[PDB]
Design a protein around this ligand. Structure first.
Ligand SMILES: NC(=[NH2+])NCCC[C@H](N)C(=O)O
Ligand SMILES: [Mg+2]
Ligand SMILES: [Mg+2]
Ligand SMILES: [Mg+2]
Ligand SMILES: [Mg+2]
Ligand SMILES: [Mg+2]
Ligand SMILES: [Mg+2]
Ligand SMILES: [Mg+2]
Ligand SMILES: [Mg+2]
Ligand SMILES: [Mg+2]
Ligand SMILES: [Mg+2]
Ligand SMILES: [Mg+2]
Ligand SMILES: [Mg+2]
Ligand SMILES: [Mg+2]
Ligand SMILES: [Mg+2]
Ligand SMILES: [Mg+2]
Ligand SMILES: [Mg+2]
Ligand SMILES: [Mg+2]
Ligand SMILES: [Mg+2]
Ligand SMILES: [Mg+2]
Ligand SMILES: [Mg+2]
Ligand SMILES: [Mg+2]
Ligand SMILES: [Mg+2]
Ligand SMILES: [Mg+2]
Ligand SMILES: [Mg+2]
Ligand SMILES: [Mg+2]
Ligand SMILES: [Mg+2]
Ligand SMILES: [Mg+2]
Ligand SMILES: [Mg+2]
Ligand SMILES: [Mg+2]
Ligand SMILES: [Mg+2]
Ligand SMILES: [Mg+2]
Ligand SMILES: [Mg+2]
Ligand SMILES: [Mg+2]
Ligand SMILES: [Mg+2]
Ligand SMILES: [Mg+2]
Ligand SMILES: [Mg+2]
Ligand SMILES: [Mg+2]
Ligand SMILES: [Mg+2]
Ligand SMILES: [Mg+2]
Ligand SMILES: [Mg+2]
Ligand SMILES: [Mg+2]
Ligand SMILES: [Mg+2]
Ligand SMILES: [Mg+2]
Ligand SMILES: [Mg+2]
Ligand SMILES: [Mg+2]
Ligand SMILES: [Mg+2]
Ligand SMILES: [Mg+2]
Ligand SMILES: [Mg+2]
Ligand SMILES: [Mg+2]
Ligand SMILES: [Mg+2]
Ligand SMILES: [Mg+2]
Ligand SMILES: [Mg+2]
Ligand SMILES: [Mg+2]
Ligand SMILES: [Mg+2]
Ligand SMILES: [Mg+2]
Ligand SMILES: [Mg+2]
Ligand SMILES: [Mg+2]
Ligand SMILES: [Mg+2]
Ligand SMILES: [Mg+2]
Ligand SMILES: [Mg+2]
Ligand SMILES: [Mg+2]
Ligand SMILES: [Mg+2]
Ligand SMILES: [Mg+2]
Ligand SMILES: [Mg+2]
Ligand SMILES: [Mg+2]
Ligand SMILES: [Mg+2]
Ligand SMILES: [Mg+2]
Ligand SMILES: [Mg+2]
Ligand SMILES: [Mg+2]
Ligand SMILES: [Mg+2]
Ligand SMILES: [Mg+2]
Ligand SMILES: [Mg+2]
Ligand SMILES: [Mg+2]
Ligand SMILES: [Mg+2]
Ligand SMILES: [Mg+2]
Ligand SMILES: [Mg+2]
Ligand SMILES: [Mg+2]
Ligand SMILES: [Mg+2]
Ligand SMILES: [Mg+2]
Ligand SMILES: [Mg+2]
Ligand SMILES: [Mg+2]
Ligand SMILES: [Mg+2]
Ligand SMILES: [Mg+2]
Ligand SMILES: [Mg+2]
Ligand SMILES: [Mg+2]
Ligand SMILES: [Mg+2]
Ligand SMILES: [Mg+2]
Ligand SMILES: [Mg+2]
Ligand SMILES: [Mg+2]
Ligand SMILES: [Mg+2]
Ligand SMILES: [Mg+2]
Ligand SMILES: [Mg+2]
Ligand SMILES: [Mg+2]
Ligand SMILES: [Mg+2]
Ligand SMILES: [Mg+2]
Ligand SMILES: [Mg+2]
Ligand SMILES: [Mg+2]
Ligand SMILES: [Mg+2]
Ligand SMILES: [Mg+2]
Ligand SMILES: [Mg+2]
Ligand SMILES: [Mg+2]
Ligand SMILES: [Mg+2]
Ligand SMILES: [Mg+2]
Ligand SMILES: [Mg+2]
Ligand SMILES: [Mg+2]
Ligand SMILES: [Mg+2]
Ligand SMILES: [Mg+2]
Ligand SMILES: [Mg+2]
Ligand SMILES: [Mg+2]
Ligand SMILES: [Mg+2]
Ligand SMILES: [Mg+2]
Ligand SMILES: [Mg+2]
Ligand SMILES: [Mg+2]
Ligand SMILES: [Mg+2]
Ligand SMILES: [Mg+2]
Ligand SMILES: [Mg+2]
Ligand SMILES: [Mg+2]
Ligand SMILES: [Mg+2]
Ligand SMILES: [Mg+2]
Ligand SMILES: [Mg+2]
Ligand SMILES: [Mg+2]
Ligand SMILES: [Mg+2]
Ligand SMILES: [Mg+2]
Ligand SMILES: [Mg+2]
Ligand SMILES: [Mg+2]
Ligand SMILES: [Mg+2]
Ligand SMILES: [Mg+2]
Ligand SMILES: [Mg+2]
Ligand SMILES: [Mg+2]
Ligand SMILES: [Mg+2]
Ligand SMILES: [Mg+2]
Ligand SMILES: [Mg+2]
Ligand SMILES: [Mg+2]
Ligand SMILES: [Mg+2]
Ligand SMILES: [Mg+2]
Ligand SMILES: [Mg+2]
Ligand SMILES: [Mg+2]
Ligand SMILES: [Mg+2]
Ligand SMILES: [Mg+2]
Ligand SMILES: [Mg+2]
Ligand SMILES: [Mg+2]
Ligand SMILES: [Mg+2]
Ligand SMILES: [Mg+2]
Ligand SMILES: [Mg+2]
Ligand SMILES: [Mg+2]
Ligand SMILES: [Mg+2]
Ligand SMILES: [Mg+2]
Ligand SMILES: [Mg+2]
Ligand SMILES: [Mg+2]
Ligand SMILES: [Mg+2]
Ligand SMILES: [Mg+2]
Ligand SMILES: [Mg+2]
Ligand SMILES: [Mg+2]
Ligand SMILES: [Mg+2]
Ligand SMILES: [Mg+2]
Ligand SMILES: [Mg+2]
Ligand SMILES: [Mg+2]
Ligand SMILES: [Mg+2]
Ligand SMILES: [Mg+2]
Ligand SMILES: [Mg+2]
Ligand SMILES: [Mg+2]
Ligand SMILES: [Mg+2]
Ligand SMILES: [Mg+2]
Ligand SMILES: [Mg+2]
Ligand SMILES: [Mg+2]
Ligand SMILES: [Mg+2]
Ligand SMILES: [Mg+2]
Ligand SMILES: [Mg+2]
Ligand SMILES: [Mg+2]
Ligand SMILES: [Mg+2]
Ligand SMILES: [Mg+2]
Ligand SMILES: [Mg+2]
Ligand SMILES: [Mg+2]
Ligand SMILES: [Mg+2]
Ligand SMILES: [Mg+2]
Ligand SMILES: [Mg+2]
Ligand SMILES: [Mg+2]
Ligand SMILES: [Mg+2]
Ligand SMILES: [Mg+2]
Ligand SMILES: [Mg+2]
Ligand SMILES: [Mg+2]
Ligand SMILES: [Mg+2]
Ligand SMILES: [Mg+2]
Ligand SMILES: [Mg+2]
Ligand SMILES: [Mg+2]
Ligand SMILES: [Mg+2]
Ligand SMILES: [Mg+2]
Ligand SMILES: [Mg+2]
Ligand SMILES: [Mg+2]
Ligand SMILES: [Mg+2]
Ligand SMILES: [Mg+2]
Ligand SMILES: [Mg+2]
Ligand SMILES: [Zn+2]
Lengths: 154, 116, 101, 112, 59, 140
RNA sequence: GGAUGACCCCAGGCGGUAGGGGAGCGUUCCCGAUGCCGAUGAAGGCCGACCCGCGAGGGCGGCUGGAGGUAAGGGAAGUGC
RNA sequence: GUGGAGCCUGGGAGUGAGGGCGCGAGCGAUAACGUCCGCGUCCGAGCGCGGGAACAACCGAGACCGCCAGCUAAGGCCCCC
RNA sequence: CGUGAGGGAAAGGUGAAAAGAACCCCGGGAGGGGAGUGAAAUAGAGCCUGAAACCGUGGGCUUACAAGCAGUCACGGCCCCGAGGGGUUGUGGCGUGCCUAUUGAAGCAUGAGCCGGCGACUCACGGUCGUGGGCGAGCUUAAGCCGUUGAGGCGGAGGC
């Protein structure tokens, strides 16, 4: 009611008009008045413990490992940037697109080729995060991304 | 995010107005007067289903009383006779018997006069 | 012939062929049950003191149900006290098979 | 078969015109015309107009016979009111409502 | 005086009951013996100008 | 089972001789007959009792000094409009009203109660004009 | 009892203002969702004597409407007159 | 004496205008639907139920829901009833 | 609106496309009835949806000897949909509106004409208990920095 555009004038006298008492028309009891306890710009972030984050990371990968949904690869045969190239590689690797896949690799050309597939989410290893792991039905990592992961939960 | 009233209050008001169909004037047209009328209505129904049990027992007793006095005794002596005879036919069935089966009620009167 | 039976804490005049709702009984639908008799009437008159020793009524339980909902509503003025309860009374439905006098 | 006409937004108060419409409901066309002709009410002019428009619709659009026509239904509904300021004493302003009317006449055929 | 004022809003029932005497009576009309037109009794006929069996005005 | 509700019955006309009987002790019985509470099928929301004819209502009797001291009272609605009439004068002027008043006060208030009062027919003198109804004489 | 909220049986408590505690319903929005329901008809509206729920409510059916809506499970509030 | 008993620690209160009645006193006039304490009680919060013609606190009695079943309480049983 | 400084509104939506209704009919016109357009015209411009108060027309039941916080319990009559139910209400029983404030209100104490929509326990930082987890003689980072472009990591100054 202080931030609203109206004057602070008392709209009519306190007593003897036969109307209810009022002050200015910005009060929240008026149509067009200020709002009581409305939202204000707000920071929702908070510092979750680092050890909780790191342990969550390891558990999320463990969960896929225990399901058999974690697959590591040395190299992406001949995928050089084209989505069709990654699709061929995926088929031979058993990724027929019936399951969503989180693809973690530092190879840019592999990420650019897979990323437009509706069933693939692509990450560089330094961006491995548990929400993205739990989002997807399968985990597919470079041996290089795997070592970055192992360095981070250590 | 904002959560304006929307549909919620209209729907609550229609539930109440629907329960108030048949009420006089604004008691079926105004949400406020209908709600006030229903407050009373619910208490009455509660109080009156308690009361209905007494209303009917009163009717049975009155009919039983007249049936007895056609055979020369009154209700209280009749009931006492039934208690000494060990007869446990309740007042709802006794009043039915007094109307629908006068030969059986005449017998029951016999048992009662004889049980004293 | 008619009989006055007692079930569910209450008394009913029953004749063969009568369908009747009584308080819920623990009896499978389709089964038949025997109701105790307080009085026989019609042809002969038998008076129980209180219940007739030999007599019984055979009834086939047709099924169980829940009665039409009753709104139990409580309100106390000037005290913001309101209560709304929905009540459905269970019942067993009986077909009166015979008066075994 | 029915024939109808509506005069919408007639600048007259519904309560006033209804009194006149009630005069001709259920009448034969000819009997309604005589009544409306000698009804000493402003509303007689407007109802007559709608009555004749319905009759014309019956004969010219809907294959009905003028000599069979009767007022099968008739009703006045209220339109948007024109709100006007009426100045009073001591600086107070009242609001006059110059009400308006939607006049419906429906004619049928009385057989025989 | 001290400005008498309605104590309660009049119900729809009571408003409309007061109006039970408001229905118009239809205009009384007799036939003109000359031109057969319907017209009020005891007036010069407005359709043909006759009254008492003779022509009184131009119509 | 539901409680028996009677279909419309032909009512019973009865004749009572009031001579020598005690005003209020006779009236309680007449009201019982009017309500039909002597009947095994009594129902409180219908007029199903007897029609009661009374003769020799002017010969009704009363104990103590009531002939002089019992005061009937009528209020006209005007200032000073409380009229007091003693039993004596009422018996000398409208004797049938003495019993009529006693019975009316013993009937329920309301529309049915007023209807029941119309089923009571009270006559001074030994005669009544209801021979066509052939009333059954009651000793009460 | 059986082992654990699986359901049953027995017993007992269950008036309530200020007020303490518990369990739920619904509204707006986010994840779920590149999904799913949808012109063979979304949301909203109007009916219902039907079904489920103690209840707040939730279904289902007929009509209207004509393009949106959004599950199990969780998250956040401009959340119920 | 196993009770919505008690004790200990801690979280959240609300209340700090009472009122009638019985008994015991003071004040008052061996006045007040008066006033001020004490013991108890009810209403407050049981303006829910029966009785008392009607009626917070007098008598009866502590309303979880349903029944067209039965026994009682105070109070009643000539008619209203 | 105010002399003036100054105050300060309301008011969005046809349809996919104007195809925005030629022409005829009643009417001075307004308006309407046909024709015609459209998947749809109670989408016809006073235009999406179209609640409620409020006002009509038609129909069912009911009402002029009756005592009323307007209901509720019972029974009966009539009407409707097909051992049942819906509507209505004649009679009988019972029955002191809602909220607020009070020792105490139906109260002749407050507030409310009625309806619809707006309308009041929040947020930041700190604190104190409780609680779900992480780690444990330790626990934890802040500003920043690097990365990301709804990716997280680093950073021990400092705090307990
Ligand atoms: N390699 C990456 N950083 N990929 C991020 C994904 C970016 C974008 N959201 C996409 O789906 O294409
Ligand atoms: Mg302000
Ligand atoms: Mg300001
Ligand atoms: Mg400002
Ligand atoms: Mg400004
Ligand atoms: Mg300003
Ligand atoms: Mg200011
Ligand atoms: Mg101000
Ligand atoms: Mg100012
Ligand atoms: Mg100022
Ligand atoms: Mg003032
Ligand atoms: Mg005022
Ligand atoms: Mg005001
Ligand atoms: Mg005002
Ligand atoms: Mg003011
Ligand atoms: Mg203000
Ligand atoms: Mg302001
Ligand atoms: Mg504004
Ligand atoms: Mg404004
Ligand atoms: Mg604003
Ligand atoms: Mg606000
Ligand atoms: Mg504020
Ligand atoms: Mg504010
Ligand atoms: Mg910020
Ligand atoms: Mg927080
Ligand atoms: Mg931060
Ligand atoms: Mg994407
Ligand atoms: Mg993708
Ligand atoms: Mg995905
Ligand atoms: Mg993505
Ligand atoms: Mg709101
Ligand atoms: Mg809203
Ligand atoms: Mg609403
Ligand atoms: Mg509401
Ligand atoms: Mg609605
Ligand atoms: Mg609702
Ligand atoms: Mg009704
Ligand atoms: Mg109404
Ligand atoms: Mg009305
Ligand atoms: Mg209405
Ligand atoms: Mg209710
Ligand atoms: Mg009850
Ligand atoms: Mg009761
Ligand atoms: Mg006797
Ligand atoms: Mg006994
Ligand atoms: Mg017994
Ligand atoms: Mg039993
Ligand atoms: Mg049978
Ligand atoms: Mg049962
Ligand atoms: Mg109140
Ligand atoms: Mg109360
Ligand atoms: Mg009350
Ligand atoms: Mg309250
Ligand atoms: Mg109170
Ligand atoms: Mg309340
Ligand atoms: Mg049952
Ligand atoms: Mg005239
Ligand atoms: Mg013509
Ligand atoms: Mg003037
Ligand atoms: Mg002025
Ligand atoms: Mg002036
Ligand atoms: Mg002025
Ligand atoms: Mg006006
Ligand atoms: Mg003067
Ligand atoms: Mg004066
Ligand atoms: Mg005056
Ligand atoms: Mg003067
Ligand atoms: Mg004046
Ligand atoms: Mg006044
Ligand atoms: Mg009105
Ligand atoms: Mg009306
Ligand atoms: Mg009037
Ligand atoms: Mg001419
Ligand atoms: Mg007798
Ligand atoms: Mg005497
Ligand atoms: Mg005389
Ligand atoms: Mg009386
Ligand atoms: Mg009475
Ligand atoms: Mg149990
Ligand atoms: Mg229990
Ligand atoms: Mg409780
Ligand atoms: Mg708890
Ligand atoms: Mg919820
Ligand atoms: Mg809600
Ligand atoms: Mg959003
Ligand atoms: Mg999405
Ligand atoms: Mg979507
Ligand atoms: Mg589909
Ligand atoms: Mg289609
Ligand atoms: Mg449809
Ligand atoms: Mg929705
Ligand atoms: Mg929505
Ligand atoms: Mg529903
Ligand atoms: Mg459609
Ligand atoms: Mg719909
Ligand atoms: Mg869309
Ligand atoms: Mg959702
Ligand atoms: Mg989640
Ligand atoms: Mg938020
Ligand atoms: Mg708010
Ligand atoms: Mg306790
Ligand atoms: Mg305690
Ligand atoms: Mg313990
Ligand atoms: Mg404590
Ligand atoms: Mg707490
Ligand atoms: Mg708390
Ligand atoms: Mg306090
Ligand atoms: Mg305090
Ligand atoms: Mg103090
Ligand atoms: Mg004090
Ligand atoms: Mg005080
Ligand atoms: Mg004290
Ligand atoms: Mg004091
Ligand atoms: Mg005392
Ligand atoms: Mg004391
Ligand atoms: Mg004593
Ligand atoms: Mg003493
Ligand atoms: Mg004392
Ligand atoms: Mg003392
Ligand atoms: Mg003295
Ligand atoms: Mg005192
Ligand atoms: Mg005293
Ligand atoms: Mg004293
Ligand atoms: Mg005390
Ligand atoms: Mg208080
Ligand atoms: Mg008490
Ligand atoms: Mg207490
Ligand atoms: Mg009490
Ligand atoms: Mg009380
Ligand atoms: Mg009471
Ligand atoms: Mg009492
Ligand atoms: Mg009492
Ligand atoms: Mg009493
Ligand atoms: Mg009392
Ligand atoms: Mg008192
Ligand atoms: Mg209890
Ligand atoms: Mg007993
Ligand atoms: Mg006793
Ligand atoms: Mg007495
Ligand atoms: Mg009696
Ligand atoms: Mg000025
Ligand atoms: Mg100016
Ligand atoms: Mg200014
Ligand atoms: Mg604006
Ligand atoms: Mg459009
Ligand atoms: Mg457009
Ligand atoms: Mg379209
Ligand atoms: Mg023209
Ligand atoms: Mg022309
Ligand atoms: Mg035109
Ligand atoms: Mg036309
Ligand atoms: Mg046209
Ligand atoms: Mg077409
Ligand atoms: Mg279509
Ligand atoms: Mg439509
Ligand atoms: Mg449309
Ligand atoms: Mg649209
Ligand atoms: Mg529209
Ligand atoms: Mg409209
Ligand atoms: Mg409407
Ligand atoms: Mg009508
Ligand atoms: Mg009379
Ligand atoms: Mg009558
Ligand atoms: Mg009643
Ligand atoms: Mg009854
Ligand atoms: Mg029926
Ligand atoms: Mg009914
Ligand atoms: Mg009925
Ligand atoms: Mg009774
Ligand atoms: Mg009252
Ligand atoms: Mg009271
Ligand atoms: Mg309320
Ligand atoms: Mg208030
Ligand atoms: Mg106050
Ligand atoms: Mg005060
Ligand atoms: Mg006071
Ligand atoms: Mg009052
Ligand atoms: Mg008053
Ligand atoms: Mg005052
Ligand atoms: Mg008041
Ligand atoms: Mg005050
Ligand atoms: Mg006003
Ligand atoms: Mg209203
Ligand atoms: Mg509102
Ligand atoms: Mg708070
Ligand atoms: Mg805030
Ligand atoms: Mg905060
Ligand atoms: Mg905090
Ligand atoms: Mg805290
Ligand atoms: Mg904590
Ligand atoms: Mg940790
Ligand atoms: Mg650390
Ligand atoms: Mg520090
Ligand atoms: Zn002529």
């Amino acid at each position: 009611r202080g931030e609203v555009a109206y004057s602070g004038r008392k709209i009519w006298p306190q007593k003897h008009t036969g109307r209810a008492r009022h002050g200015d028309i910005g009060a929240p009891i008026f149509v067009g008045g200020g709002v009581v306890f409305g939202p204000k710009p707000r920071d929702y972030s908070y510092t979750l413990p680092k050890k909780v984050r790191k342990k969550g990371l390891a558990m999320a990968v463990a969960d896929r490992a225990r399901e058999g949904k974690l697959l590591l690869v040395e190299a992406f045969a001949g995928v050089n940037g084209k989505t069709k190239e990654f699709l061929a590689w995926a088929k031979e690797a058993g990724l027929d697109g019936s399951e969503s896949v989180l693809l973690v690799t530092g190879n840019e050309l592999v990420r650019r080729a897979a990323r437009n597939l509706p069933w693939v989410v692509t990450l560089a290893p330094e961006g491995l995060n548990v929400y993205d792991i739990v989002r997807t039905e399968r985990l597919v990592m470079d041996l290089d991304a795997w070592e970055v992961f192992q360095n981070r939960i250590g | 995010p904002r959560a304006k009233t929307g549909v919620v209050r209209r729907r609550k008001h229609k539930k109440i107005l629907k329960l108030a169909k048949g009420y006089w004037g604004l008691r079926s047209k105004s949400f406020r007067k209908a709600r006030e009328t229903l407050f009373a209505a619910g208490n009455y129904a509660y109080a009156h289903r308690k009361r209905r049990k007494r209303d009917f027992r009163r009717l049975w007793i009155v009919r039983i009383n007249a049936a007895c006095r056609q055979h020369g005794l009154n209700y209280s002596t009749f009931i006492h006779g039934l208690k000494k005879a060990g007869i446990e036919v309740d007042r709802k069935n006794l009043a039915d018997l007094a109307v629908r089966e006068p030969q059986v009620f005449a017998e029951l009167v016999e048992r009662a006069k004889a049980a004293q | 012939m008619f009989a006055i039976v007692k079930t569910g804490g209450k008394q009913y005049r029953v004749e063969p062929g009568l369908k009747l709702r009584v308080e819920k009984l623990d009896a499978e639908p389709g089964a038949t049950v025997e109701l105790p008799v307080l009085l026989l009437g019609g042809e002969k008159t038998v008076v129980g003191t209180p219940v007739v020793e030999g007599a019984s009524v055979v009834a086939e339980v047709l099924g169980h149900g829940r009665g039409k909902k009753i709104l139990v509503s409580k309100f106390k003025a000037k005290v913001q006290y309101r209560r709304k309860k929905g009540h459905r009374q269970p019942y067993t439905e009986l077909l009166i098979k015979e008066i075994r006098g | 078969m029915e024939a109808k006409a509506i005069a919408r937004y007639v600048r007259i108060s519904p309560r006033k015109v209804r009194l006149v419409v009630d005069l001709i409901r259920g009448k034969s066309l000819e009997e309604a015309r005589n009544i409306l002709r000698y009804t000493n009410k402003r509303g007689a002019y407007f109802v007559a107009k709608v009555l004749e428009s319905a009759a014309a619709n019956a004969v010219n659009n809907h294959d009905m016979l003028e000599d069979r026509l009767y007022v099968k239904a008739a009703y006045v509904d209220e339109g948007p009111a024109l709100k006007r300021v009426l100045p009073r004493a001591r600086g107070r302003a009242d609001i006059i409502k110059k009400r308006t009317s939607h006049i419906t006449v429906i004619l049928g055929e009385k057989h025989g | 005086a001290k400005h008498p004022v309605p104590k309660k809003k009049t119900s729809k029932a009571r408003r409309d009951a007061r109006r039970s005497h408001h229905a118009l009576t239809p205009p009384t009309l007799v036939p003109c013996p000359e031109c057969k037109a319907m017209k009020p009794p005891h007036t010069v006929c407005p359709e043909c100008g006759y009254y008492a069996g003779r022509k009184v005005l131009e119509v | 089972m539901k409680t028996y509700v009677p279909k419309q019955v032909e009512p019973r006309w009865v004749l009572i001789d009031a001579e020598g009987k005690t005003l209020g002790r006779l009236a309680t019985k007449i009201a019982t007959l009017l309500r039909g509470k002597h009947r095994p099928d009594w129902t409180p929301n219908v007029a199903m009792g007897d029609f009661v004819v009374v003769v020799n209502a002017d010969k009704i009797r009363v104990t103590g000094k009531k002939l002089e001291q019992k005061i009937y009272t009528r209020y006209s609605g005007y200032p000073g409009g409380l009229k007091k009439i003693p039993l004596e004068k009422m018996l000398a002027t409208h004797p049938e009203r003495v019993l009529e008043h006693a019975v009316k006060g013993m009937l329920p208030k309301g529309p049915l109660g007023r209807r029941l009062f119309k089923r009571l027919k009270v006559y001074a003198g030994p005669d009544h004009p209801h021979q066509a109804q052939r009333p059954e004489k009651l000793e009460v």
